[PDB]
Amino acid sequence: SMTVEGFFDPATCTISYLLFDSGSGECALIDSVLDYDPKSGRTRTASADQLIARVAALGARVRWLLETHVHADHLSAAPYLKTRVGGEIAIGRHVTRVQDVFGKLFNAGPAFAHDGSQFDRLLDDGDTLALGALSIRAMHTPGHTPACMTYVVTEARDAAAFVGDTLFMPDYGTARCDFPGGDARSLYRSIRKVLSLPPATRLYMCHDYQPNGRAIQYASTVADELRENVHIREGVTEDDFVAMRTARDATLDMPVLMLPSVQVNMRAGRLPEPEDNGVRYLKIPLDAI
Amino acid sequence: GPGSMTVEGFFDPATCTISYLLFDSGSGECALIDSVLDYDPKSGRTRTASADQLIARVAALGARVRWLLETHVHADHLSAAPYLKTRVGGEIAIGRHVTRVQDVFGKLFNAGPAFAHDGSQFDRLLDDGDTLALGALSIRAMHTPGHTPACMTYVVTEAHAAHDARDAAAFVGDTLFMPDYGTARCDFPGGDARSLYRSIRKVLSLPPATRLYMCHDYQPAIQYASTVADELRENVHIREGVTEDDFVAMRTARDATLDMPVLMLPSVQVNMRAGRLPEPEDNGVRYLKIPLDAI
Ligand SMILES: [Ca+2]
Ligand SMILES: [Ca+2]
Ligand SMILES: [Cl-]
Ligand SMILES: [Cl-]
Ligand SMILES: [Cl-]
């Protein structure tokens, strides 16, 4: 009835998803990657082209291009995909807060809108998106960023939820909360909301880092998380989690692709407009963050 | 035997760069070569820890810095030459063909007319054969292109040497590496393997006892120096017997397998301005520019 296919990118450890309703052919793509080499400034389309090819092989029609949040670890390929498979690009409405902060950091100037108008749909908690016979509910789950959404898919429970970076596989734990607007106490509460779904609900992760050298994995369940999550299993209190997450964040370095990712993703994945020589430039602020 | 000169190398673990302090203890005059401003590309943060080590050693020696020398326009680290100039003095010098590098990379970074392509950001532009005085020592700039169009090898000798104090030291930049590691890549704009072969042959025509101080150690513990004799005998790429054509074929094939250096784009846009950072935008913040799909 629902088909979920994950596509793992070794360079950024991101899992992008194809969500398919067999009965209608209607499809959503979630958290796509535009391949980017920060050493050379080169972009490639190999990861997004794999999604396009699978869409075509399934005879699928893409209706939604969903972002769980404004990613700091890879560039989105949403505009590239929209041109080539269709669909509407959607993200949580609090992307506008990210635009305000990062528009300032990158000195984006007056041509860069802070109203989320680069996106087709801005989503509020509880909004639903139709996908053939399925319904996708946008559940606001802030903590890693203030804009994070978890997409809960059911027949219009036997549910699936795309949790973004709100959870990892149980053996890895939880995501950092030191992005601007991030908050560990919020993340704890948003995780408790996700783990309030029925226990057999499948949870699909945005990232996997293969702790202890195990195989790549990116699906868990609400039950397995409550039982085994190394940071936030049943029994862990909010205060204890906040203290752990805050200390753990304090010791982290900046994600390698933070500055390139955020300036692109805050524009719905559009690249900066060309300068007068016809070249587009990412801007890296010195000693500013 | 060896000059009276003192050479101390400072290895940076992040970039594998070796920066040098060259000291004439008799006069107290000093040169600093190939300094590093520490730079984290993930966050845009700079630090001065590497440069501060050079400053502290200069002060402990009672030395006075007269020269801040670059062997070439570096693609693997940002220079700290201006930060050093302000705090220890000295003139910043590089080979005159830096102007060619400025033409190419001024365009790549769209730096515009405020960025001069005449080398005026540097205090001294050096031609082959130029000598720089350093107390009882003399530094001869030998042009050794190949890795880049501008590379210089700085050959140091006592200006007026007794019989047993005639041996030279040369700071070779990224031409030769240690014998077991070979030679540097030649795929930077204006780089040329055939030129590099010829330049290395010139460096290896210096007297056999000449000490050769390396710009990097990529296999660190640290190996700072080789000699002309050892390089001619042992260098895995360009020992005696390797023909020019064979070296070019090897070097070309090898370059094709390499990725871009991590700091290539931040380094060249700062080092083409003698290590100055870009001027701030209207909001008071300085930005590095990363060209998309342009190189
Ligand atoms: Ca994330
Ligand atoms: Ca070099
Ligand atoms: Cl606006
Ligand atoms: Cl904050
Ligand atoms: Cl060329």
Side-chain angles (χ1 to χ4, degrees), chain A residues 2-60 62 64-154 156 158-192 194-233 235-269 271-272 274-289, chain B residues 1-106 108-165 167-218 220-239 241-295:
Chain A
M2 200 195 311
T3 295
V4 175
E5 292 177 9
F7 293 75
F8 173 79
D9 176 46
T12 65
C13 295
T14 301
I15 303 94
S16 306
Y17 295 95
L18 195 152
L19 166 72
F20 180 63
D21 178 51
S22 276
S24 61
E26 301 283 84
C27 178
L29 302 178
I30 307 179
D31 293 342
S32 70
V33 175
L34 180 74
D35 307 295
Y36 176 65
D37 176 2
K39 309 184 306 297
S40 61
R42 293 177 192 130
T43 60
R44 289 167 57 246
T45 61
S47 295
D49 287 344
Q50 290 174 22
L51 305 178
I52 292 169
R54 185 60 175 161
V55 168
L58 295 168
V62 175
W64 304 110
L65 297 167
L66 298 183
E67 302 292 347
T68 52
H69 60 294
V70 182
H71 300 283
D73 64 291
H74 65 268
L75 281 64
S76 180
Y80 177 83
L81 289 166
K82 183 176 180 177
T83 296
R84 285 163 180 82
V85 296
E88 284 184 276
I89 301 171
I91 197 167
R93 182 180 307 278
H94 299 337
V95 68
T96 63
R97 304 187 187 168
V98 180
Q99 298 179 319
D100 281 340
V101 170
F102 288 101
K104 176 176 193 281
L105 176 70
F106 291 108
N107 200 32
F112 167 63
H114 300 178
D115 65 352
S117 54
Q118 304 94 330
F119 295 87
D120 299 313
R121 293 283 312 258
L122 293 180
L123 300 165
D124 302 306
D125 190 48
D127 281 354
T128 64
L129 303 182
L131 189 73
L134 310 175
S135 188
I136 305 167
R137 176 169 55 99
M139 176 164 80
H140 186 219
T141 53
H144 175 63
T145 83
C148 296
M149 311 299 307
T150 290
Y151 299 113
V152 180
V153 187
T154 52
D158 270 284
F162 301 87
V163 298
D165 281 330
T166 301
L167 275 169
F168 287 139
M169 293 297 291
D171 63 2
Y172 195 77
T174 57
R176 67 200 290 167
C177 294
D178 59 339
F179 192 82
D183 187 63
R185 203 168 292 276
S186 296
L187 180 66
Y188 183 88
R189 293 172 186 177
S190 292
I191 290 167
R192 288 303 172 176
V194 178
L195 302 183
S196 288
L197 295 168
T201 299
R202 296 189 66 164
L203 304 176
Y204 290 99
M205 317 297 161
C206 189
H207 291 92
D208 191 59
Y209 306 106
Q210 298 96 65
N212 209 45
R214 69 153 156 74
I216 296 151
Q217 293 177 348
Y218 44 79
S220 194
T221 65
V222 162
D224 300 323
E225 293 289 4
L226 290 164
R227 195 176 64 253
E228 296 174 3
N229 189 288
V230 293
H231 291 172
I232 201 160
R233 58 181 62 184
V236 177
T237 79
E238 181 180 287
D239 268 2
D240 292 338
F241 175 79
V242 172
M244 179 285 304
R245 189 66 265 173
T246 302
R248 192 71 62 87
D249 291 353
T251 77
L252 289 179
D253 301 318
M254 194 95 335
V256 174
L257 295 184
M258 172 105 176
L259 295 169
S261 299
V262 178
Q263 74 191 274
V264 165
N265 295 342
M266 75 184 192
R267 299 184 163 97
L271 301 182
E275 292 184 359
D276 64 344
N277 69 334
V279 177
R280 304 178 182 259
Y281 292 89
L282 299 174
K283 293 168 70 174
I284 307 307
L286 294 167
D287 296 307
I289 203 183
Chain B
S4 50
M5 86 191 70
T6 293
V7 179
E8 292 180 6
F10 291 76
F11 173 80
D12 172 47
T15 61
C16 298
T17 301
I18 304 167
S19 302
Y20 288 98
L21 191 156
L22 169 65
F23 175 67
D24 177 41
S25 63
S27 64
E29 305 283 78
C30 173
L32 301 179
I33 302 170
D34 292 344
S35 72
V36 174
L37 179 75
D38 306 294
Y39 176 68
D40 174 9
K42 307 184 299 298
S43 66
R45 301 175 177 155
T46 65
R47 291 169 35 255
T48 61
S50 300
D52 289 340
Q53 297 172 14
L54 300 175
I55 290 168
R57 182 63 169 164
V58 166
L61 291 171
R64 189 171 54 166
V65 181
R66 304 310 304 265
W67 300 111
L68 305 164
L69 304 176
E70 306 289 348
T71 53
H72 61 290
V73 176
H74 298 285
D76 63 289
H77 67 271
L78 283 65
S79 177
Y83 173 82
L84 287 166
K85 183 180 181 186
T86 299
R87 288 165 177 76
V88 300
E91 285 190 279
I92 303 170
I94 195 165
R96 186 176 298 279
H97 299 340
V98 69
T99 62
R100 302 184 189 171
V101 184
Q102 299 181 320
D103 282 339
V104 166
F105 289 95
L108 181 68
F109 297 108
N110 199 32
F115 167 64
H117 305 176
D118 64 357
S120 60
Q121 300 87 344
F122 296 87
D123 299 309
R124 298 274 196 128
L125 301 179
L126 297 173
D127 298 310
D128 186 59
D130 281 351
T131 56
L132 302 176
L134 186 77
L137 312 173
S138 177
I139 301 169
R140 164 169 64 98
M142 181 191 310
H143 182 220
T144 51
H147 176 57
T148 85
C151 300
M152 311 291 316
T153 287
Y154 297 116
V155 183
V156 189
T157 50
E158 275 185 46
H160 230 139
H163 194 56
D164 290 353
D167 291 357
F171 300 84
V172 299
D174 277 333
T175 55
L176 271 166
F177 289 142
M178 293 291 292
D180 59 332
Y181 205 84
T183 56
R185 62 200 293 174
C186 290
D187 59 341
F188 184 92
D192 185 64
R194 205 171 291 277
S195 303
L196 181 61
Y197 184 85
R198 297 176 187 180
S199 287
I200 288 170
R201 290 286 181 251
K202 193 151 72 132
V203 170
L204 299 180
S205 305
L206 290 167
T210 305
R211 294 190 78 182
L212 305 175
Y213 283 100
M214 301 304 149
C215 185
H216 289 93
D217 187 355
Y218 288 120
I222 310 299
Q223 288 170 292
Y224 297 99
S226 188
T227 66
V228 164
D230 295 330
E231 293 282 10
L232 283 165
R233 200 178 54 245
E234 293 175 356
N235 184 288
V236 297
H237 286 173
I238 199 167
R239 64 180 70 176
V242 178
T243 64
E244 185 179 276
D245 275 357
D246 283 340
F247 174 79
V248 170
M250 181 280 302
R251 189 64 258 177
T252 299
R254 181 166 194 87
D255 287 353
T257 75
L258 304 179
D259 299 324
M260 198 78 81
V262 175
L263 300 182
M264 168 100 180
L265 298 170
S267 294
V268 174
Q269 74 188 275
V270 165
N271 294 337
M272 74 187 188
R273 301 180 157 100
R276 299 190 178 88
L277 307 182
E279 288 303 303
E281 295 192 353
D282 60 8
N283 69 341
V285 177
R286 306 176 183 266
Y287 296 89
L288 299 171
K289 294 173 71 172
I290 309 307
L292 294 165
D293 296 306
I295 196 160

